Design a protein around this ligand. Structure first.
Ligand SMILES: [Cl-]
Ligand SMILES: [Cl-]
Length: 129
């Protein structure tokens, strides 16, 4: 599923990501835009052999099992395919674990390089939330 910007903002806020661990909603929408272009089916191989999955490009080295990543912890206890569903619950629940583990949203490379320090609240402007 390719989400609309405001459609994704509303789903993220329903799951409680708005100001989760201090990160306002626009941070999460900005991160999803540049990680996946709002596409739940997005998959991208990483240089280290792992793969990133779903709307928030969650990585198979630590967080989900895809059966082909060597160092694979599966800390969210899910198959990586679960992160590709039209329902974003699994991705949100796993992202909450990731963002609570020390470096916050810096775990998302696209967030650090393209959202951090910018006007992230632009990503929810015009949305009825
Ligand atoms: Cl929209
Ligand atoms: Cl992509």
């Amino acid at each position: 599923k390719v989400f609309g910007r405001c459609e994704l903002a509303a789903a993220m806020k329903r799951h409680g990501l708005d100001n989760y661990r201090g990160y306002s909603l626009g941070n999460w929408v900005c991160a999803a835009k540049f990680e996946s272009n709002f596409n739940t089916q997005a998959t991208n191989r990483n240089t280290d052999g792992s793969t990133d999955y779903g709307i928030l490009q969650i990585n198979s080295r630590w967080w989900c099992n895809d059966g082909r990543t060597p160092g694979s912890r599966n800390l969210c206890n899910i198959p990586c395919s679960a992160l590709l569903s039209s329902d974003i619950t699994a991705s949100v629940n796993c992202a909450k674990k990731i963002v609570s583990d020390g470096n916050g949203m810096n775990a998302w490379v696209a967030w650090r390089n393209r959202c951090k320090g910018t006007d992230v609240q632009a990503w929810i402007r015009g949305c009825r939330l």
